[model samples]
Target: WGQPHGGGWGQPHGGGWGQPHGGGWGQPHGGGWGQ
Candidate 1:
């Protein structure tokens, strides 16, 4: 029961919580790879 909660949130929610790409990828909009 509790174990499932941890694994579930850790994988999916974890990404949304501490993921940089969560903002539409590593780089933001209107920005090139090597300006």
Candidate 2:
């Protein structure tokens, strides 16, 4: 129910799209699945 940027990654609310492993959610790879 969301849409990623036109050229870059992630959605508009920091909760969609990104590096695939740790880009969205705004943690850069430090939240969600690991920390």
Candidate 3:
């Protein structure tokens, strides 16, 4: 079990290890309005 605890400079501002689902909101910060 591992994850960024929303502290600082830990989220990578990009997130994830494989592929980004979408612009900083698809997975963690997703808005799902546009691509």
Best by TM-score: 1
Clashing pairs in 1: none
Q: Tens-digit lDDT track for model 1 on 1-35?
A: 55674355456653465566635665647867665
Q: Name model 1 segments beyond 4 Å from true.
A: 1-7, 22-35
Over 1-35, each residue of candidate 3 has an lDDT whose tens digit, in order, gives 56546675434555665555654435545444555
The local distance difference test score of model 2 is: 0.51
Clashes per candidate, residues 3 or more apart or on different chains: 0, 0, 3
Candidate 2, residues 1-35, lDDT tens digits: the string is 55455654543456544554543555545546655
Cα error of candidate 3 at position 18, Å:
18
Order by TM-score, highest first: 1, 3, 2
Model 3 whole-model lDDT (C-alpha atoms): 0.53
Per-model TM-score versus the true fold = 0.20, 0.13, 0.17
Q: Which of the numbered candidates is closest to the native, going by highest lDDT?
A: 1
Report lDDT (Cα) of residue 4, candidate 1.
Answer: 71
Question: What is model 3's C-alpha RMSD?
Answer: 10.1
User: Model 2 off-target regions past 4 Å?
Assistant: 1-6, 13-35
